[PDB]
mmCIF file with all atom_site columns, N, CA and C and ligand atoms in Angstrom:
data_model
loop_
_atom_site.group_PDB
_atom_site.id
_atom_site.type_symbol
_atom_site.label_atom_id
_atom_site.label_alt_id
_atom_site.label_comp_id
_atom_site.label_asym_id
_atom_site.label_entity_id
_atom_site.label_seq_id
_atom_site.pdbx_PDB_ins_code
_atom_site.Cartn_x
_atom_site.Cartn_y
_atom_site.Cartn_z
_atom_site.occupancy
_atom_site.B_iso_or_equiv
_atom_site.pdbx_formal_charge
_atom_site.auth_seq_id
_atom_site.auth_comp_id
_atom_site.auth_asym_id
_atom_site.auth_atom_id
_atom_site.pdbx_PDB_model_num
ATOM   1  N  N   . UNK A 1 1 ? 12.100 145.246 139.945 1.00 0.00 ? 1 UNK A N   1
ATOM   2  C  CA  . UNK A 1 1 ? 12.244 146.625 140.380 1.00 0.00 ? 1 UNK A CA  1
ATOM   3  C  C   . UNK A 1 1 ? 12.747 147.544 139.269 1.00 0.00 ? 1 UNK A C   1
ATOM   4  N  N   . UNK A 1 2 ? 13.931 147.243 138.745 1.00 0.00 ? 2 UNK A N   1
ATOM   5  C  CA  . UNK A 1 2 ? 14.582 148.125 137.800 1.00 0.00 ? 2 UNK A CA  1
ATOM   6  C  C   . UNK A 1 2 ? 13.600 148.520 136.699 1.00 0.00 ? 2 UNK A C   1
ATOM   7  N  N   . UNK A 1 3 ? 13.015 147.502 136.079 1.00 0.00 ? 3 UNK A N   1
ATOM   8  C  CA  . UNK A 1 3 ? 12.182 147.770 134.909 1.00 0.00 ? 3 UNK A CA  1
ATOM   9  C  C   . UNK A 1 3 ? 10.832 148.369 135.289 1.00 0.00 ? 3 UNK A C   1
ATOM   10 N  N   . UNK A 1 4 ? 10.291 148.001 136.448 1.00 0.00 ? 4 UNK A N   1
ATOM   11 C  CA  . UNK A 1 4 ? 9.095  148.645 136.946 1.00 0.00 ? 4 UNK A CA  1
ATOM   12 C  C   . UNK A 1 4 ? 9.305  150.205 136.991 1.00 0.00 ? 4 UNK A C   1
ATOM   13 N  N   . UNK A 1 5 ? 10.419 150.631 137.613 1.00 0.00 ? 5 UNK A N   1
ATOM   14 C  CA  . UNK A 1 5 ? 10.794 152.030 137.714 1.00 0.00 ? 5 UNK A CA  1
ATOM   15 C  C   . UNK A 1 5 ? 11.039 152.656 136.345 1.00 0.00 ? 5 UNK A C   1
ATOM   16 N  N   . UNK A 1 6 ? 11.782 151.980 135.466 1.00 0.00 ? 6 UNK A N   1
ATOM   17 C  CA  . UNK A 1 6 ? 12.059 152.595 134.179 1.00 0.00 ? 6 UNK A CA  1
ATOM   18 C  C   . UNK A 1 6 ? 10.758 152.879 133.452 1.00 0.00 ? 6 UNK A C   1
ATOM   19 N  N   . UNK A 1 7 ? 9.829  151.945 133.524 1.00 0.00 ? 7 UNK A N   1
ATOM   20 C  CA  . UNK A 1 7 ? 8.609  152.057 132.767 1.00 0.00 ? 7 UNK A CA  1
ATOM   21 C  C   . UNK A 1 7 ? 7.844  153.269 133.268 1.00 0.00 ? 7 UNK A C   1
ATOM   22 N  N   . UNK A 1 8 ? 7.743  153.380 134.588 1.00 0.00 ? 8 UNK A N   1
ATOM   23 C  CA  . UNK A 1 8 ? 7.012  154.444 135.245 1.00 0.00 ? 8 UNK A CA  1
ATOM   24 C  C   . UNK A 1 8 ? 7.601  155.849 134.960 1.00 0.00 ? 8 UNK A C   1
ATOM   25 N  N   . UNK A 1 9 ? 8.929  155.932 134.798 1.00 0.00 ? 9 UNK A N   1
ATOM   26 C  CA  . UNK A 1 9 ? 9.650  157.171 134.527 1.00 0.00 ? 9 UNK A CA  1
ATOM   27 C  C   . UNK A 1 9 ? 9.474  157.693 133.121 1.00 0.00 ? 9 UNK A C   1
HETATM 28 CO CO1 . LIG B 2 . ? 14.924 149.433 131.789 1.00 0.00 ? 1 LIG B CO1 1
#
């Protein structure tokens, strides 16, 4: 989750 979101941001 965390890194999925960071990447997308
Ligand atoms: Co990150």
